[PDB]
Design a binder for these strands. Structure first.
Length: 97
DNA sequence: GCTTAAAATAACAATAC
DNA sequence: GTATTGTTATTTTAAGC
C-alpha cells in the first residue's frame, strides 16, 4: 500500500507550516492523517514514528501530560533553529544518506 | 557487489493528573 | 490507577562507493 516516506520532511513542514511558533504532537498526527489517509489507515504506530521524526531532527521542547490534555491535548514548542537548519539548506530530503 | 548512513519504526519508560 | 507524552534504542530501507 504505497512505500514509506521521509517523516522528517512532513514534520519540518508541519512545524514550518506553523510560523505562529507553536505545534502539537497530536495536532501533527491530525495534520498528517488529514493529509494522508493511507497513513491514518495503517498507522503502524505513527506516535513514536512521528514524535521521533518530530523531535529527532528539530530538537525542540515539548510538554508532557499537562493539566489540559483531555485525550490528545498537548503542546509542542520549537525554537528558532529548525527553520535555521532548513533555510541554510534547500529542502534536501536525503543529504547524501 | 558491499558498506555505510540516515530515515523510519517500534517498544518502553517516566511523569502527571 | 490511568492516561498522555517523551525518550531511547533498534530496525529497515535506500543510496553512496
Amino acid at each position: 500500500v504505497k512505500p514509506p516516506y521521509s517523516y522528517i520532511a512532513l514534520i519540518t513542514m508541519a512545524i514550518l507550516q506553523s510560523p505562529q511558533k507553536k505545534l502539537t504532537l497530536s495536532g501533527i498526527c491530525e495534520f498528517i492523517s488529514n493529509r494522508f489517509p493511507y497513513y491514518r489507515e495503517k498507522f503502524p504506530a505513527w506516535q513514536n514514528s512521528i514524535r521521533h521524526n518530530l523531535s529527532l531532527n528539530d530538537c525542540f521542547v515539548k510538554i508532557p501530560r499537562e493539566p489540559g490534555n483531555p485525550g490528545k491535548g498537548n503542546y509542542w514548542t520549537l525554537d528558532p533553529q529548525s527553520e535555521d537548519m532548513f533555510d541554510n539548506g534547500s529542502f534536501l530530503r536525503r543529504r547524501k544518506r
